[PDB]
Chains A and B, each alone.
With several copies, the nearest count.
Chain A
C-alpha cells in the first residue's frame, strides 16, 4: 500500500477549482451524495490494488502504454 509522506516536499500541483452543480447532476440528492462521499472516503488516504485495477480498466491499453512511456522519459531525465 501507498501512504502520503509525513512532510510534503511538493505542493506546486495547483489543481483546478471544484465545479459546483445541482445534486441531480451528482449522485442524485444531498443524502445520496453524502452517503456516497462517506462510502468513498476510506480510499482517500491510500492507494492499493483497487486503485490500480480501476486505473487499468479506465485506461485499457493506450493509457498504460502512454503512462509507461512518459515514466520512462522521466526516469531517463532524472
Chain B
C-alpha cells in the first residue's frame, strides 16, 4: 500500500529558482 500511494501520490511558475532548476534538470535526463 505504501509503494502504491507513493507511485500514485506523486508531486504536483514565476519563481526564478524553479526556472533555473528546470533548465539544469533538462540538461540532465
Contacts and interface: CB of A to CB of B under 8 A. Distances in A.
Direct contact of A and B (CB under 8 A): yes
Contacts of B8: none
A22 B24 contact: yes
Interface in B1-29: 3, 24-25, 28-29
Main secondary structure of the interface of A (DSSP, over half): loop
Main secondary structure of the interface of B (DSSP, over half): helix
A20 interface: yes
B28 A22 contact: yes
A12 interface: no
Contacts of B24: 22
Interface in A29-68: none
A13 to B, nearest CB: 12
Interface string A3-20: 000000000000010001
Contact of B3 (A16, A20, A21, A22): A16
Q: Which 3 A-B residue pairs are closest in the complex by CB-CB distance?
A: A22-B28, A20-B29, A16-B3
